[PDB]
Structure 1
Amino acid sequence: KLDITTLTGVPEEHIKTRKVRIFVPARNNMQSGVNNTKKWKMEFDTRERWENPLMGWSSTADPLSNLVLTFSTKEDAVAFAEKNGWSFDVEERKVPKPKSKSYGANFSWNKRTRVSTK
């Protein structure tokens, strides 16, 4: 098994305490486009983001707070997480169901699908 953890140079705190999530990003509900929901992505766990005293900017001590790796398939992401010794959490991809849509149902004769306005 690949154990490249000793070669990546990551400190121990960010190898064992981390919790990598492997998922396909959900579609932005504000848009009908689905081009972003095609590649598997890998992100770490959110950590403390305190307020900088001088300016109020959101400070952080998490070096891995902006890492978003994109993978073609779930298996590749799982393998990459196993390579670096990161506790991965895979979420199964959710694909919208095929839906039976009929424009003629808008004017049904004995059904509730009859619309009152167009």
Structure 2
Amino acid sequence: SSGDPLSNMNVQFGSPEEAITFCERNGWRWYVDGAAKPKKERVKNYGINFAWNKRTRVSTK
């Protein structure tokens, strides 16, 4: 049992600015848990797995 009517409502939005303006419209006490995740460029290719004098030589396969 739960006495919370608003505990089951997730409202979808495109940007955090739209959700912030919606919460300022409806008068809720809003806060943002985390910002948008930046993407880190990670290089992935098959030649690192078989290398010469490198510690990244794979022991599987």
Same fold (TM over 0.5): yes
Cα distance per residue 1:13-61 (max 9 Å; x no partner):
xxxxxxxxxxxxxxxxxxxxxxxxxxxxxxxxxxxxxxxxxxxxxx000
Identity of aligned residues (%): 53
TM-score by length of 1: 0.48
TM-score by length of 2: 0.87
Q: Shift of the alpha carbon at 1:100?
A: 1.0
From the two aligned structures, give the one with the greater strand fraction: 1
Aligned residues: 60
In structure 1, stretches of 5+ residues that fail to align are 1-58
Q: Trace 1:7-86 onto structure 2 (pairs within 5 A).
A: 59-86=1-28
Show the counterpart of 1:110: 53
Cα-Cα RMSD: 1.2
**Rg larger in 1 or in 2?**
2
In structure 2, stretches of 5+ residues that fail to align are none
- Where relative contact order (Cα < 8 A, 6+ residues apart) is larger, the structure is 1
